[PDB]
UniProtKB/Swiss-Prot annotation, chains A, B, C, D, E, F, G, H, I, J, K, L, M, N, O, P, Q, R, S, T, U, V, W, X:
Domain notes: The normal, monomeric form has a mainly alpha-helical structure. The disease-associated, protease-resistant form forms amyloid fibrils containing a cross-beta spine, formed by a steric zipper of superposed beta-strands. Disease mutations may favor intermolecular contacts via short beta strands, and may thereby trigger oligomerization.
Localisation: Cell membrane; Golgi apparatus
Identification of the protein by name: Major prion protein
Subunit structure, interactors included: Monomer and homodimer. Has a tendency to aggregate into amyloid fibrils containing a cross-beta spine, formed by a steric zipper of superposed beta-strands. Soluble oligomers may represent an intermediate stage on the path to fibril formation. Copper binding may promote oligomerization. Interacts with GRB2, APP, ERI3/PRNPIP and SYN1. Mislocalized cytosolically exposed PrP interacts with MGRN1; this interaction alters MGRN1 subcellular location and causes lysosomal enlargement. Interacts with APP. Interacts with KIAA1191. Interacts with ADGRG6.
Family: Belongs to the prion family.
Residue numbers of the full-length protein present here: 119 to 143 of 254
Function field: Its primary physiological function is unclear. May play a role in neuronal development and synaptic plasticity. May be required for neuronal myelin sheath maintenance. May promote myelin homeostasis through acting as an agonist for ADGRG6 receptor. May play a role in iron uptake and iron homeostasis. Soluble oligomers are toxic to cultured neuroblastoma cells and induce apoptosis (in vitro). Association with GPC1 (via its heparan sulfate chains) targets PRNP to lipid rafts. Also provides Cu(2+) or Zn(2+) for the ascorbate-mediated GPC1 deaminase degradation of its heparan sulfate side chains.
Disease: Found in high quantity in the brain of humans and animals infected with degenerative neurological diseases such as kuru, Creutzfeldt-Jakob disease (CJD), Gerstmann-Straussler syndrome (GSS), scrapie, bovine spongiform encephalopathy (BSE), transmissible mink encephalopathy (TME), etc.
Species assigned in the record: Mesocricetus auratus (Golden hamster)
Superkingdom per UniProt: Eukaryota
Length: 25, 25, 25, 25, 25, 25, 25, 25, 25, 25, 25, 25, 25, 25, 25, 25, 25, 25, 25, 25, 25, 25, 25, 25
């Protein structure tokens, strides 16, 4: 099993500084 | 089993500094 | 089993500093 | 079983500093 | 006639296990 | 006639286990 | 005639186990 | 007649296990 | 007649295990 | 008649295991 | 098993500095 | 098993400095 | 001048038969 | 002048038969 | 002048029979 | 002048029979 | 002048029978 | 002048029978 | 520090004339 | 620091004349 | 630092005359 | 630093006259 | 530094007269 | 540094008169 969601989204006129995304372990 | 939600969303005219997202363990 | 919600949302003209999101354990 | 809600919401013209969200254990 | 709505929606950071959708009869 | 609504909605950081939706008869 | 509403809504950080929705008859 | 809606939607960072969708009968 | 909708959507950073879609009967 | 929709969509950074799609009957 | 979502999204008029994405472990 | 999503997306009029993407381990 | 509001709202699981809306004169 | 609102809204699982909307005069 | 709104909205799992929309005069 | 809005929207799992849209006069 | 909007939208799993759209006059 | 919008959109898993679109007059 | 909210909102069938928004100083 | 929100929102069937938005200083 | 949001949004059936957006200083 | 959002959005059936967008200074 | 967003978007059935976009200074 | 977004987008059934885009200074 283990159906695992990740990151989904919309950035519209937005700002994001130094994101750290780890998909695992 | 283990159906696990992640991160879904909309950023509209928004600011997010140094997010840390870990999807696992 | 274990159907587990994550983080879903809308950021509209908003600010979020250094969020830490862990989806697991 | 264990149907577990997470975090859902709307941030409109809002500010949130250093949130810590843990979805697990 | 018979204008019949179905299923429309948004899943944001969410989990749904074994859904059964029947559009008919 | 028979204008019939279905299911419309938003799931934000939510969990739903084994839903059964029948649109008909 | 027969204008019939269905199910519309928002689930925010919520949990719903084994819902049964029948739109018909 | 019989204008019949199906399934339309957005899955953003989400998980769905073993869905069963039947469009007919 | 019988104008029948199918399945339309967006999967963004999402996971779906063993879906079964039948368009007919 | 019988104008019948199929499956249209976008998979972005997503995972789908063993889908079964039947367009007919 | 282990159907695991990654990162899917739209950047529209947006800025992202030094992102670190690890898909594994 | 292990169906694992990667990174899919659209950059429209956007800027991204020094991204680091590792698909493995 | 003449800043004039129109009709804004949410219909959730609701039914409305033969509405007549005129925005003008 | 004459800033005039129109019709904005959400229909979720709802039914509306034969609406007549005139934006003008 | 005359900045005039039209019709904007979301139909989620909804049904609408024979709408008549006139944007003008 | 005369900046005039039209029709913008989302149909998700919805049904609409014989719409008549006139953008003009 | 006369900046005039038309019809823009998304049909996701939806059905529309015999639409009549006139952009002019 | 007369900047006039037409029809732009996405049909995803959708059905549309006998549409009539006239861009002119 | 200084996590500062901006302007987030929904305008549904509404009218707003000559707004002046300054996000800064 | 200085995580600063901007302007995020939805305009549905709405009218806005001569807005002035300055994001800076 | 200085993570600064811009303008993100949806215009659905809406009208906006002579907007002035300055992203800077 | 200075991660700065711009303008991201969707115009659906909408009208915008003489916009002035400056991304700089 | 200075990661700066530009203009990203979708125009669907929309009209825009004499836009002036300057990306610089 | 200075990673600077430009203009990216989709025009679907849309009209744009005399746009002026300057990418520089």
């Amino acid at each position: 099993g283990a159906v695992v969601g990740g990151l989904g989204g919309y950035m519209l006129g937005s700002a994001m500084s130094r994101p750290m995304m780890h998909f695992g372990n």
